[PDB]
Amino acid sequence: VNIKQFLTYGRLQELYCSVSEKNLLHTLLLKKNQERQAQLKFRFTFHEVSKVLKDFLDDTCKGFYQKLNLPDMDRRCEHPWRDLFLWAILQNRQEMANYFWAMGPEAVAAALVGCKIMKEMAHLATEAESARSMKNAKYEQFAMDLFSECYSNSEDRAYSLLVRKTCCWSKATVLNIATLAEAKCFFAHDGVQALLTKVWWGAMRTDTSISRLVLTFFIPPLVWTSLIKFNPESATFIRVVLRRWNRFWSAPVTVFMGNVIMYFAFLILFSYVLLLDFRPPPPYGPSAAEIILYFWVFTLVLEEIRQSFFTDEDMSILKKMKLYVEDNWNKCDMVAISLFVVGLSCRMAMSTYEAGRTVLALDFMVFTLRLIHIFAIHKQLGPKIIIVERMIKDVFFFLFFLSVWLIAYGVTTQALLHPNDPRIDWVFRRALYRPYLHIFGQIPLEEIDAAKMPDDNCTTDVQEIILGTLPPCPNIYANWLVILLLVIYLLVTNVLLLNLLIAMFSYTFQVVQENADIFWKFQRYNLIVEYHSRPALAPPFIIISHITQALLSFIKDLLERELPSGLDQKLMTWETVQKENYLAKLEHEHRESSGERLRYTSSKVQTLLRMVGGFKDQEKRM
Amino acid sequence: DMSILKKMKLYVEDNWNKCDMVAISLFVVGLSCRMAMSTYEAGRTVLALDFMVFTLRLIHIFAIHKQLGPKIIIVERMIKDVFFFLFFLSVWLIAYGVTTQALLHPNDPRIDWVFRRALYRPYLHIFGQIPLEEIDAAKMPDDNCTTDVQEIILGTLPPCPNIYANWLVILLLVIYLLVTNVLLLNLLIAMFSYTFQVVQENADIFWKFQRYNLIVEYHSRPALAPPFIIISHITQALLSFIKDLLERELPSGLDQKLMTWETVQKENYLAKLEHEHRESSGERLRYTSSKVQTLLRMVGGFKDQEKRM
Numbered sequence: 001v002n003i004k005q006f007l008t009y010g011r012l013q014e015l016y017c018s019v020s021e022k023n024l025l026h027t028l029l030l031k032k033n034q035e036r037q038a039q040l041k042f043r044f045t046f047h048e049v050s051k052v053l054k055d056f057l058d059d060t061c062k063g064f065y066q067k068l069n070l071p072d073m074d075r076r077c078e079h080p081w082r083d084l085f086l087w088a089i090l091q092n093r094q095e096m097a098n099y100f101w102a103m104g105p106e107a108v109a110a111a112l113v114g115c116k117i118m119k120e121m122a123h124l125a126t127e128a129e130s131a132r133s134m135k136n137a138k139y140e141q142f143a144m145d146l147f148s149e150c151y152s153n154s155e156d157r158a159y160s161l162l163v164r165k166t167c168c169w170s171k172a173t174v175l176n177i178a179t180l181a182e183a184k185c186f187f188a189h190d191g192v193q194a195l196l197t198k199v200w201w202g203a204m205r206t207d208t209s210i211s212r213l214v215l216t217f218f219i220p221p222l223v224w225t226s227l228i229k230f231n232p233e234s235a236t237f238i239r240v241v242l243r244r245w246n247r248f249w250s251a252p253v254t255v256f257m258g259n260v261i262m263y264f265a266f267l268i269l270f271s272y273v274l275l276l277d278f279r280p281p282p283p284y285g286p287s288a289a290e291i292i293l294y295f296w297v298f299t300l301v302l303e304e305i306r307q308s309f310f311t312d313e314d315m316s317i318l319k320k321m322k323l324y325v326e327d328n329w330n331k332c333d334m335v336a337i338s339l340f341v342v343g344l345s346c347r348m349a350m351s352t353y354e355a356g357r358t359v360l361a362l363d364f365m366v367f368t369l370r371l372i373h374i375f376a377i378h379k380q381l382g383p384k385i386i387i388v389e390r391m392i393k394d395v396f397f398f399l400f401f402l403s404v405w406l407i408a409y410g411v412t413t414q415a416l417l418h419p420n421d422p423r424i425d426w427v428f429r430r431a432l433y434r435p436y437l438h439i440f441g442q443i444p445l446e447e448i449d450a451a452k453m454p455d456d457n458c459t460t461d462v463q464e465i466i467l468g469t470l471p472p473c474p475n476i477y478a479n480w481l482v483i484l485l486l487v488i489y490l491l492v493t494n495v496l497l498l499n500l501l502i503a504m505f506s507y508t509f510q511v512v513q514e515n516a517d518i519f520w521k522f523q524r525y526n527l528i529v530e531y532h533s534r535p536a537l538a539p540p541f542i543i544i545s546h547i548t549q550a551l552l553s554f555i556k557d558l559l560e561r562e563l564p565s566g567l568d569q570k571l572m573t574w575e576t577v578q579k580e581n582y583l584a585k586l587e588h589e590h591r592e593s594s595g596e597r598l599r600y601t602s603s604k605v606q607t608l609l610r611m612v613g614g615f616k617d618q619e620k621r622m
Numbered sequence: 623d624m625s626i627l628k629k630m631k632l633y634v635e636d637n638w639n640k641c642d643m644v645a646i647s648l649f650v651v652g653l654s655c656r657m658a659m660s661t662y663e664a665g666r667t668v669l670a671l672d673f674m675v676f677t678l679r680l681i682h683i684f685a686i687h688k689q690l691g692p693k694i695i696i697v698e699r700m701i702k703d704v705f706f707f708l709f710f711l712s713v714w715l716i717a718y719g720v721t722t723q724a725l726l727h728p729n730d731p732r733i734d735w736v737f738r739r740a741l742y743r744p745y746l747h748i749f750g751q752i753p754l755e756e757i758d759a760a761k762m763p764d765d766n767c768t769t770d771v772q773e774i775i776l777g778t779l780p781p782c783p784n785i786y787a788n789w790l791v792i793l794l795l796v797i798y799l800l801v802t803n804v805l806l807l808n809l810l811i812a813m814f815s816y817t818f819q820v821v822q823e824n825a826d827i828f829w830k831f832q833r834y835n836l837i838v839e840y841h842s843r844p845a846l847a848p849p850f851i852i853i854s855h856i857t858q859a860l861l862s863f864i865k866d867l868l869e870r871e872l873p874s875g876l877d878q879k880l881m882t883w884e885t886v887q888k889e890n891y892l893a894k895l896e897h898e899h900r901e902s903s904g905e906r907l908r909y910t911s912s913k914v915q916t917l918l919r920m921v922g923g924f925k926d927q928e929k930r931m
């Protein structure tokens with residue numbers, strides 16, 4: 001059977017129409033068909049398949065079947081193994097999909113696509129057993145093992161395989177598909193990390209010492225010395241010195257360094273303006289340092305705009321905005337920008353001056369916390385960010401129990417101690433703020449224990465309590481009960497509930513620390529990619545880079561590169577050979593396994609018993 | 623006798639050696655400053671720090687005991703954990719402290735008090751020092767306070783804390799207490815627990831290496847303890863001018879006998895390894911499958927020959 005001749009588009013559509021009607025793919029195709037019928041022979045059509053694929057990849061299946069809209073039904077599929085793999089993946093058939101992947105040309109990209117589709121469908125997950133089998137798909141492992149084989153083979157063709165635009169997946173890069181699939185374990189591969197290190201250092205050699213690089217950063221003229229080794233490849237002298245300077249000052253590591261230093265400078269200036277040089281409204285004018293801070297934040301806004309609208313390429317504006325706002329650091333920045341603008345606006349008026357100063361203090365808090373993202377560069381600091389996020393989630397869930405318990409205890413103690421205090425603010429103080437402070441050692445027994453209550457001048461008159469002339473007299477009717485409740489609260493809260501939260505923290509830390517390497521390598525990938533696409537200048541100076549880019553656009557890649565047809569075909573054949581070698585080694589390993597040997601021995605012993613019995617009977621005939 | 627530079631490099635490679643060097647330098651600087659009236663207090667301060675260094679130097683003798691040795695390594699790794707935790711702690715404390723200083727004392731110009739309220743007070747919150755009389759308006763005393771900047775700088779009266787939005791200051795303090803005191807402190811403690819677990823898994827090996835190092839260190843030391851060690855030093859110098867348990871040179875016959883004995887021991891060890899490998903389950907399975915294959919082929923041939931008859 002020749003699959004190239006066997007699989008026509010009509011045949012493929014017939015296969016898509018022959019879905020068992022008990023699996024998720026049939027339901028999804030039914031929903032697509034119902035939507036199409038509402039908006040406007042074969043039960044299902046390639047339009048429905050394209051829409052279903054769009055709900056899992058949304059960029060990869062660009063005109064897989066919409067190109068001709070519908071293609072000729074007697075025409076053979078241009079990518080038969082790709083189509084068969086996609087069809088066998090959409091319906092949770094993993095063995096068949098494994099076979100189709102083993103016969104397919106672009107296997108790393110196919111495996112990453114399969115892992116993405118498996119996780120998205122396990123998010124859909126109509127059933128639960130299918131969802132569990134689809135959680136353990138092991139396609140990212142196929143991609144990782146094939147790429148390990150490829151990287152061990154050549155280590156230079158592996159990088160090109162990482163960055164080349166695929167032919168079977170609509171010019172999508174393997175790294176693009178891994179990002180779409182969120183394949184954290186693939187990004188943690190040694191080959192991917194090596195390519196990331198090569199991108200990180202740019203023109204310099206990756207073995208460059210940190211001390212030499214920092215010292216050359218702080219002494220720019222020393223870059224023309226041989227202190228920093230660079231990778232191979234009047235007017236000439238100027239050109240070569242400019243080339244050396246640009247190659248050093250364009251590397252993502254130096255851009256990162258400069259951005260970190262200028263962010264420290266920005267925080268220092270922000271703190272100076274907020275704490276020492278915050279002047280009255282424009283009647284007495286903002287200080288010059290404040291205007292410098294305004295310009296700095298304006299350049300930050302320009303950088304945000306560049307990242308949200310003019311990032312790297314041309315897509316839908318809405319798609320680019322969605323990609324921008326999907327990053328949590330991006331929305332953190334947006335919050336900081338909005339807070340600064342509101343603060344500045346309120347500060348410009350006398351009646352809102354204090355509110356503006358308050359909002360600006362909160363904005364400094366937000367910017368300083370924003371500074372945290374640079375810790376992903378270090379293995380010992382990166383994973384702790386993820387730990388802190390999960391631990392914040394743990395705190396959020398613990399807060400339900402804490403709030404219920406504190407409401408009960410605080411209202412009971414407020415009723416027992418100050419039944420005649422009408423003021424609501426003091427009700428909430430004594431009911432929640434004081435019990436919360438008990439957790440951290442703040443136990444004011446002079447307000448709770450009668451024997452410790454001072455002889456202060458106190459009133460029982462409600463009007464005098466409301467007026468605030470004298471503090472209310474605490475009720476000591478049954479003070480033993482108040483003290484017993486405080487003892488119980490101290491035990492329960494401070495030991496039991498606090499250590500329940502701490503045990504939750506410990507479990508979270510243990511779970512993240514088990515996978516610390518993978519998490520940090522994914523973080524490092526994201527940080528290196530972020531600073532590789534950034535302009536070489538740090539804000540405020542980034543205004544120069546923005547102006548230069550705009551002027552270049554008006555007047556007139558390391559990753560995701562397009563290859564010549566011959567080199568592309570050579571790479572595809574090389575990867576196919578690597579996949580064949582990997583599968584052959586897997587088969588050989590399987591054959592020599594203990595279970596396989598046991599099965600072979602038992603079967604052959606059975607055959608030997610039968611044939612030896614026959615031979616013995618024949619001999620006994622003689 | 624080696625290269626002088628090699629011996630110095632070997633000396634300074636030991637951390638206890640550089641600890642001692644720090645202690646000696648501190649004592650010398652302290653004594654020198656103490657010799658002058660204008661540097662007397664600085665000399666006393668440096669000598670106090672030197673006592674601290676010497677007392678911590680005393681820790682090295684704990685390697686002699688199995689229950690004390692490994693704890694030194696645990697403490698070193700835990701200090702590294704603290705160093706890495708300090709980045710998060712410093713960033714968070716800078717954010718919170720500057721925000722609260724701006725909210726509470728926007729008119730206080732003095733930088734020392736800025737840094738006090740921005741980092742020293744939030745750090746002390748971690749250890750139960752929560753002065754609500756400076757943060758909560760309802761707990762603020764009726765003390766005699768000024769809003770004049772000149773009077774604040776002069777120090778005549780304490781500055782009046784700003785109570786503009788005190789609910790926000792209190793909410794920030796509540797959030798800081800939760801985040802820092804529970805979350806971040808227990809993140810550091812979980813790091814500590816992981817470090818302790820990793821070292822305690824290999825406690826025996828670490829302590830035995832420590833014991834080796836300590837025994838070797840005190841085997842090569844002169845028999846007299848300082849100050850008295852001056853007598854041993856003078857005796858050694860006099861012996862050098864006028865005129866080993868480990869690392870000993872053997873006669874040629876005994877050396878050859880030892881080499882042959884070790885070769886025989888290695889041969890016995892390798893033979894036992896080979897015998898263990900042969901009788902393993904996997905090897906037996908491989909042998910049985912291969913011989914069953916051979917038996918199938920040869921029995922088929924024999925059966926065909928019999929069927930010829």
Ligand SMILES: C[C@@H]1CC[C@@]2(OC1)O[C@H]1C[C@H]3[C@@H]4CC=C5C[C@@H](OCC[C@H](CO)CO[C@@H]6O[C@H](CO)[C@@H](O[C@H]7O[C@H](CO)[C@@H](O)[C@H](O)[C@H]7O)[C@H](O)[C@H]6O)CC[C@]5(C)[C@H]4CC[C@]3(C)[C@H]1[C@@H]2C
Nearest residue numbers: 449450451452453454455476477479480481483484487488
């Ligand atoms: C292992 C486990 C640990 C936890 C726990 O169980 C065991 O421990 C138990 C111990 C127990 C507690 C044991 C004892 C008591 C005392 C008892 O009061 C007796 C009531 C009498 C009558 O009403 C009040 O007396 C008098 O009051 C006056 C004030 O009103 C004081 O005058 C002061 O007045 C003014 C003070 O402002 C000022 O003029 C002066 O300062 C002074 O003149 C007198 O001096 C004092 O004599 C109340 C109960 C209490 C606190 C127990 C509570 C429960 C425990 C904590 C257990 C735990 C589960």
Ligand SMILES: C[C@@H]1CC[C@@]2(OC1)O[C@H]1C[C@H]3[C@@H]4CC=C5C[C@@H](OCC[C@H](CO)CO[C@@H]6O[C@H](CO)[C@@H](O[C@H]7O[C@H](CO)[C@@H](O)[C@H](O)[C@H]7O)[C@H](O)[C@H]6O)CC[C@]5(C)[C@H]4CC[C@]3(C)[C@H]1[C@@H]2C
Nearest residue numbers: 402403406425428429432433436468759760761762789792
């Ligand atoms: C489970 C979880 C725990 C954590 C938390 O969430 C839930 O708990 C919540 C509880 C909440 C708090 C609940 C209540 C409040 C009170 C509120 O003030 C109301 C504002 C008004 C108006 O501006 C001020 O009032 C008045 O001020 C005056 C001072 O200025 C006082 O006069 C004093 O003046 C001088 C004091 O020097 C002296 O003359 C005397 O001593 C006295 O005359 C009055 O007596 C008082 O009436 C501010 C907010 C706060 C603290 C909440 C903050 C957030 C919580 C902790 C929640 C947690 C997330």
Ligand SMILES: C[C@@H]1CC[C@@]2(OC1)O[C@H]1C[C@H]3[C@@H]4CC=C5C[C@@H](O)CC[C@]5(C)[C@H]4CC[C@]3(C)[C@H]1[C@@H]2C
Nearest residue numbers: 399403407423424425426427428429432433789793
């Ligand atoms: C963590 C939750 C948030 C929401 C909430 O409980 C904790 O906060 C508390 C703060 C309370 C305020 C505190 C002070 C005052 C001033 C007083 O003159 C009138 C009542 C009012 C507004 C109170 C109304 C009820 C409020 C919002 C409580 C509310 C359930």
Ligand SMILES: C[C@@H]1CC[C@@]2(OC1)O[C@H]1C[C@H]3[C@@H]4CC=C5C[C@@H](O)CC[C@]5(C)[C@H]4CC[C@]3(C)[C@H]1[C@@H]2C
Nearest residue numbers: 708712716731732733734735736737738740741742
């Ligand atoms: C753990 C870090 C060490 C470094 C540092 O932050 C914590 O220490 C802080 C102590 C600060 C001092 C404290 C007191 C004074 C006296 C005052 O009249 C002038 C300013 C000055 C020197 C301050 C300058 C800034 C300093 C070094 C801060 C500096 C970022």
Ligand SMILES: *[C@@H]1O[C@H](CO)[C@@H](O)[C@H](O)[C@H]1NC(C)=O
Nearest residue numbers: 454455456457458459469470
């Ligand atoms: C309490 O107020 C009354 C009002 O007359 C006064 O006489 C008395 O001295 C006050 N006591 C204290 C402790 O302030």
Ligand SMILES: *[C@@H]1O[C@H](CO)[C@@H](O)[C@H](O)[C@H]1NC(C)=O
Nearest residue numbers: 763764765766767768778779
């Ligand atoms: C505060 O200082 C003024 C100066 O006249 C004085 O009259 C007043 O008694 C002082 N109050 C306190 C509480 O020291």
Ligand SMILES: [Ca+2]
Nearest residue numbers: 307329330333
């Ligand atoms: Ca951003």
Ligand SMILES: [Ca+2]
Nearest residue numbers: 638639640642
């Ligand atoms: Ca020494």
